[PDB]
Amino acid sequence: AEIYNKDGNKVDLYGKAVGLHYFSKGNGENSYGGNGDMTYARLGFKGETQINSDLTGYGQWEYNFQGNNSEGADAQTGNKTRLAFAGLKYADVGSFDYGRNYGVVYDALGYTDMLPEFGGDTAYSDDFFVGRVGGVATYRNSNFFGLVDGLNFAVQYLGKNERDTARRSNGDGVGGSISYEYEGFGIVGAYGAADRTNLQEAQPLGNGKKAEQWATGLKYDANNIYLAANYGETRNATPITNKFTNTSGFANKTQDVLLVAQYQFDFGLRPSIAYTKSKAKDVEGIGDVDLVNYFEVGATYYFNKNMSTYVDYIINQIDSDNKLGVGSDDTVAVGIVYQF
Amino acid sequence: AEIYNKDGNKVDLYGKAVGLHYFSKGNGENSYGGNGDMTYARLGFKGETQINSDLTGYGQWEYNFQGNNSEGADAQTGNKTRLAFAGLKYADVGSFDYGRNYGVVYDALGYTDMLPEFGGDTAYSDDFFVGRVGGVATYRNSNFFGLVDGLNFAVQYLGKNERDTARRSNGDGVGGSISYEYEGFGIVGAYGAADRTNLQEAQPLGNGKKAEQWATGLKYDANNIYLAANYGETRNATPITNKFTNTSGFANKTQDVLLVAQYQFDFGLRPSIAYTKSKAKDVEGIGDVDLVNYFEVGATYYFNKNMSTYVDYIINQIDSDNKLGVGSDDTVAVGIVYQF
Amino acid sequence: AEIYNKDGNKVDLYGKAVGLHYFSKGNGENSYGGNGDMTYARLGFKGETQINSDLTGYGQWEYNFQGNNSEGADAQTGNKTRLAFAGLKYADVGSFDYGRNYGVVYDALGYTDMLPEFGGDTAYSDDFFVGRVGGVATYRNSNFFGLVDGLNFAVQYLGKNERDTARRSNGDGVGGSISYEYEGFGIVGAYGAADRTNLQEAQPLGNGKKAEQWATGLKYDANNIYLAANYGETRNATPITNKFTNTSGFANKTQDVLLVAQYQFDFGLRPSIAYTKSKAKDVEGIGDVDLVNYFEVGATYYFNKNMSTYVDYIINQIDSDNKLGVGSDDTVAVGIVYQF
Ligand SMILES: [Rb+]
Ligand SMILES: [Rb+]
Ligand SMILES: [Rb+]
Ligand SMILES: [Rb+]
Ligand SMILES: [Rb+]
Ligand SMILES: [Rb+]
Ligand SMILES: [Rb+]
Ligand SMILES: [Rb+]
Ligand SMILES: [Rb+]
Ligand SMILES: [Rb+]
Ligand SMILES: [Rb+]
Ligand SMILES: [Rb+]
Ligand SMILES: [Rb+]
Ligand SMILES: [Rb+]
Ligand SMILES: [Rb+]
Ligand SMILES: [Rb+]
Ligand SMILES: [Rb+]
Ligand SMILES: [Rb+]
Ligand SMILES: [Rb+]
Ligand SMILES: [Rb+]
Ligand SMILES: [Rb+]
Ligand SMILES: [Rb+]
Ligand SMILES: [Rb+]
Ligand SMILES: [Rb+]
Ligand SMILES: [Rb+]
Ligand SMILES: [Rb+]
Ligand SMILES: [Rb+]
Ligand SMILES: [Rb+]
Ligand SMILES: [Rb+]
Ligand SMILES: [Rb+]
Ligand SMILES: [Rb+]
Ligand SMILES: [Rb+]
Ligand SMILES: [Rb+]
Ligand SMILES: [Rb+]
Ligand SMILES: [Rb+]
Ligand SMILES: [Rb+]
Ligand SMILES: [Rb+]
Ligand SMILES: [Rb+]
Ligand SMILES: [Rb+]
């Protein structure tokens, strides 16, 4: 909610309380998302300052607070900064910003990431360009310098983040995304290539010095109808873990298919029908294995713009044969959300 | 403080800075609350949205920030999310909410929890129903569906939270609290029963598959006078630690007595006289031992609704003989508080 | 930004998003500040309540959120509470506050701490009186009880903070700072003495039961010109680490020299020219070694009061001979900042 607007500067302090619970077979040990309490709260701000007639400065921060944790020693599990960036926009020239932000491949993967709780599994956090990453300088353009309306292109420069784990580590890289929108329809083509750290190559799973991520996207967003389709492939980028041998690393090749179909009713009901298939290739000692495979059936109910309730059910298509050890059981998520 | 109120939605961002210090014999090693710096700050929001004529949606989050910590490695000690929940209320039918919230036994124990700093020791955090817990769905009713004014009943459903420590672990359970208020007077009767996890049974202290918590409460809150009385008993629920054998677990039986007497002066002075007795029974290898035993003498001074200063002194009645090893020395707490 | 002002109470919720990056030789292993991503975000509040005609209550909290971290296990590195205090001011008598706050020696060292990114190395955090510390009760006076305008004196009482590390540990102590300001000019003389904990004496580096910190300061702050000069000496107080023997402790004697020269242009440009020399003496097994030695050349550009960009370059004067093992390579920092 916008809480400040005075002398050429506006502040929008936003947040949400999500009373979330997961339902699965067993103790959520071998399911799609686990079971039990998954309550979380959000807090952050969106800032914008009118510098002059056609130049604006901005700054955004977002944090994830967890409510499913105790007040004891485990009081800080899953607590992280999601967004933290500042930048400038100069009319019909472009926008530049530095700080923790979504990658440029998410410009294509954000098409199918509209499900009540789950969906968009390929948009991993701290994974080069598919999700929220550090060391990123993003240039974004709207309407091609104010010449061709709808045509939007973006370029990003990923910096090296040598961390304790190879899962969260990355090298230097450049990404891009081209998009055009015309009367409901929208087509996106994103690509991102980056170097891999020495710790990433040291892992038992995954072999290669270079990491590549690309995704395409077609959608229709007009008259209460949302239909989305994503197809993408990653090279030495998708984070994978073997539950049998207790080994971590990356998948050499993945085919990622996302399909989403939603309708928004006038009385405030959004049923959601989706499909997700993500299969890996050339896994060390394994070969070809399905990482993510399911059908999504859900429904979201908005009371207004502030209060909402949703039930998100996933029909897990992953077999018990899975050579890596991915959860095969179904996961039902019911959540009540207040937001401001 | 309420910072937003527009189109059927209001946001109340609240918080406080508590400049707190503890005084005790030694290095607070063997006292009621320890000694030294205990400065802490709070931050959170209270939200409410007017959905229609007689339906309201809400969402609340609360966090505890610690100021008595360094900026080094110990920069996150005692930092936790206290509240994180969202829910709906529909006029004279009831109110339902899910997310981290106080248990239903606190509806009775909150009667005597009005002391400047200490008091309400039996209202432990992450302990089934006596305090703030996870996995709770609470239904609350006011004026018995709008028929019998003053009569308030509530039901809660505690979910299983299998954690790293048995202290913070709990199973599935159901709780309840019945209350009636009439011209200053108020009588409460709360009860809560829940299952115990395998880690809780594995502890050297405490034996039993079921955990029970019940408490009664009588008070008078009229014309600047606050008199409160609590009596409760727990079954395999009260968290206890043996300082001699270095063992943790739960007490099989506890008798909990709370007495509070306060007056609010017109010039802004609230003296506080209280008594607390909590004795354990059937402790493994010990038997009967006093957990909490003291007299409280304190005073709170409100400058206004925002600024306050208080001195809270506890006369510890616990002997040095204590077979478990509970602190016997007195603890004096002086704190200066700003709140908004 | 001030977001609340009603019935004798005002709340100022402030924060900033700093898109910061560091440039150095190698992997920032042997430089002045390191290299890579250093993005951070801030959040806090400034409160003030009008109690009566000439008495005001206040409360301030400040937190540092890090954006250069992952969402995984390292999601809470460098996250700390910087400020957390509440206090009272009574017209021309003085101001008293308790809670985490800057030390009284920073009243002199804050003179040269005006550089775009770096500078003020002698103002260490959790170090007795030079920076932000715990267990501090500060009395501050303005215009000498309203008699001699410009003359400001302050007294502080540091409490003992026995922590896990000797670096962040301190004992009981008293500090003071006397200052006078007259038409741009300002002269400050600060002093602070405190006891050392048993863990601080147990360290291989540093020998002495008492810790002393004093600093002087001359400045000119008038007509877009800022010229500052600091000189100070510490006794068993300055935290030092030997990179060769892997030992930590304190320096017995340090000579601290700070020089700053800045001009503020009318179109919004602030070039910064600074000098810093901090040499240690009587180091255990070493003797005399330079801790901090460099020239600062930088520039800050304010678009307005909310948006800013700066480039801060340090010319590291420290040799590779350094017997302790302090970074010798240069560090270039470029940052884009939004604030509200
Ligand atoms: Rb189930
Ligand atoms: Rb686990
Ligand atoms: Rb611990
Ligand atoms: Rb821990
Ligand atoms: Rb988003
Ligand atoms: Rb949705
Ligand atoms: Rb970044
Ligand atoms: Rb970087
Ligand atoms: Rb490999
Ligand atoms: Rb909906
Ligand atoms: Rb498979
Ligand atoms: Rb709606
Ligand atoms: Rb299945
Ligand atoms: Rb004492
Ligand atoms: Rb301890
Ligand atoms: Rb550390
Ligand atoms: Rb730690
Ligand atoms: Rb309360
Ligand atoms: Rb009180
Ligand atoms: Rb919960
Ligand atoms: Rb649960
Ligand atoms: Rb037992
Ligand atoms: Rb009072
Ligand atoms: Rb006893
Ligand atoms: Rb009052
Ligand atoms: Rb005693
Ligand atoms: Rb460089
Ligand atoms: Rb390091
Ligand atoms: Rb971990
Ligand atoms: Rb960790
Ligand atoms: Rb400052
Ligand atoms: Rb500056
Ligand atoms: Rb303090
Ligand atoms: Rb202290
Ligand atoms: Rb020593
Ligand atoms: Rb400037
Ligand atoms: Rb040297
Ligand atoms: Rb300016
Ligand atoms: Rb050099």
Look up the CATH number of the domain holding residue A213. 2.40.160.10
* Cβ–Cβ < 8 Å for B138, B219: no
CA triplet A111, A115, A120: central angle to 5 degrees?
Answer: 55
User: In terms of C-beta density within 10 A (0-12 exposed, 13-18 middle, 19 or more buried), how is residue B335 classed?
Assistant: buried
Closest to B133 in 3D by CA, of B152, B110, B158, B109: B158
Q: Which of A47, A80, A99 sits opposite C39 (nearest CB)?
A: A99
Task: Please give the helix or strand (H or E) that residue A330 lies within, else none.
Answer: none
CA distances from residue A139 to A16, A154, C161 in whole angstroms, order as listed: 29, 6, 47
Collapsing DSSP to helix, strand or coil, A202 comes out as coil
Q: Which ligand is nearest to the CA of A69?
A: 20
CA distances from residue B110 to B22, B121, B168, B258 in whole angstroms, order as listed: 24, 11, 21, 11
Closest to A175 in 3D by CA, of A140, A150, A145, A200: A140
Looking at the complex, report in whole angstroms how far the Cα of residue C73 sits from the nearest Cα belonging to chain A: 8
Looking at the complex, report in whole angstroms how far the Cα of residue B267 sits from the nearest Cα belonging to chain A: 35
Closest to C24 in 3D by CA, of C310, C323, C340, C316: C316
User: Which of B66, B100, B138 would you mutate first to test chain A, the one with the most A CBs within 10 A?
Assistant: B100
* Cβ–Cβ < 8 Å for A156, A175: yes
Q: Which two tokens stand for residue B83?
A: 């509240």
Please report the resolution in angstroms: 3.0
Separation CA A118–CA C104 (nearest Å): 52
Q: Which two tokens stand for residue C195?
A: 């006891």
- Report the amino acid identity of residue C253: K
Q: How far is CA C22 from the centre of its chain?
A: 20
Separation CA B161–CA A36 (nearest Å): 8
Collapsing DSSP to helix, strand or coil, A144 comes out as helix
Across the B/C interface, how many CB contacts are shorter than 8 Å?
155
* Cβ–Cβ < 8 Å for B286, B323: yes
Q: For residue C9, what is the nearest residue in chain B, using CA coordinates?
A: B306
Structure letter (DSSP) for residue B24: E
Q: Which two tokens stand for residue C272?
A: 């910064």
Sign of CA dihedral B225, B231, B237, B241: positive
Specify the length of chain A in residues.
340
Separation CA B123–CA B238 (nearest Å): 9
* Cβ–Cβ < 8 Å for C47, C61: no
Looking at the complex, report in whole angstroms how far the Cα of residue C337 sits from the nearest Cα belonging to chain A: 6
Separation CA A304–CA B9 (nearest Å): 10
Structure letter (DSSP) for residue B31: B
Separation CA A241–CA A285 (nearest Å): 13
The total number of structural domains in chain C stands at 1
- Report the amino acid identity of residue A118: F
* Cβ–Cβ < 8 Å for B104, B155: yes
Neighboring chain C residues of A164 at a CB cutoff of 8 Å: 73-74
Number of other residues whose CB lies within 10 A of the CB of residue A86: 29
* Cβ–Cβ < 8 Å for C98, C137: yes
Separation CA C240–CA C204 (nearest Å): 11
Q: How much of chain B is in helix, strand and coil states, percent to nearest 5?
A: 5, 60, 40
As a three-state string, the secondary structure of A71-115 is: CCCCCCCCCEEEEEEEEEECCCCCEEEEEEEECCCHHHHCCCCCC
Neighbours of chain C (3+ CB pairs under 8 A): A, B
Separation CA A128–CA A119 (nearest Å): 19
* Cβ–Cβ < 8 Å for A7, A32: no
Collapsing DSSP to helix, strand or coil, B199 comes out as helix
The residue behind tokens 């300082």 is B243
Q: What is the dihedral of CA B101, B106, B111, B112, to 10 degrees?
A: -100
Separation CA C19–CA C337 (nearest Å): 6
Collapsing DSSP to helix, strand or coil, A145 comes out as helix
Closest to B238 in 3D by CA, of B129, B106, B134, B138: B129
Separation CA C250–CA A38 (nearest Å): 46
b (16+ CB within 10 A) / e for B220-259: ebeeeebbbbbbbbbbbbbbbebeeeeebbbbbbbbbbbb
Experimental method: X-ray
Separation CA A62–CA A42 (nearest Å): 7
Separation CA A230–CA C128 (nearest Å): 57
Neighboring chain B residues of C98 at a CB cutoff of 8 Å: 19-21, 39, 336
Closest to A65 in 3D by CA, of C23, C229, B81: B81
Residue B84 and residue A72: Cβ atoms within 8 Å? no
Closest to C194 in 3D by CA, of C233, C147, C156: C156
Q: How far is the CA of C110 from the centre of ligand 31 (A)?
A: 7
Sign of CA dihedral B18, B23, B26, B30: negative
* Cβ–Cβ < 8 Å for A254, A279: yes
Closest to B77 in 3D by CA, of C233, C192, C134: C134
Chain B residues whose C-beta sits inside 8 Å of any chain C C-beta: 1-3, 13, 15-21, 27, 36-37, 39-41, 43, 65-76, 303-307, 336-340
- Report the amino acid identity of residue B201: E
Q: Which two tokens stand for residue C155?
A: 């007294």
Residues 6+ positions from B246 with CB-CB distance below 8 Å: none
* Cβ–Cβ < 8 Å for A162, A128: no
Separation CA A109–CA A215 (nearest Å): 7
Range of the domain at B62: 1-340
Separation CA C143–CA A159 (nearest Å): 51
Separation CA B193–CA B216 (nearest Å): 15
Separation CA A177–CA B335 (nearest Å): 56
Sign of CA dihedral A20, A21, A27, A30: negative
Q: Which of C3, C87, C163 sits opposite B336 (nearest CB)?
A: C87
- Report the amino acid identity of residue C32: Y
Residue A41 and residue B165: Cβ atoms within 8 Å? no
What count of Cα atoms within 13 Å lies in the side-chain half-sphere of residue A179? Answer: 30
Neighbours of chain A (3+ CB pairs under 8 A): B, C
Separation CA C131–CA A197 (nearest Å): 37
Neighboring chain A residues of B161 at a CB cutoff of 8 Å: 36-37, 68, 70
Collapsing DSSP to helix, strand or coil, B109 comes out as helix
The residue behind tokens 């709170």 is B300
Residue B67 and residue C165: Cβ atoms within 8 Å? no
User: Which of C3, C4, C46, C81 would you mutate first to test chain B, the one with the most B CBs within 10 A?
Assistant: C81
* Cβ–Cβ < 8 Å for B112, B228: yes
Separation CA B203–CA B299 (nearest Å): 40
Residue C68 and residue A9: Cβ atoms within 8 Å? no
Separation CA A91–CA A56 (nearest Å): 8
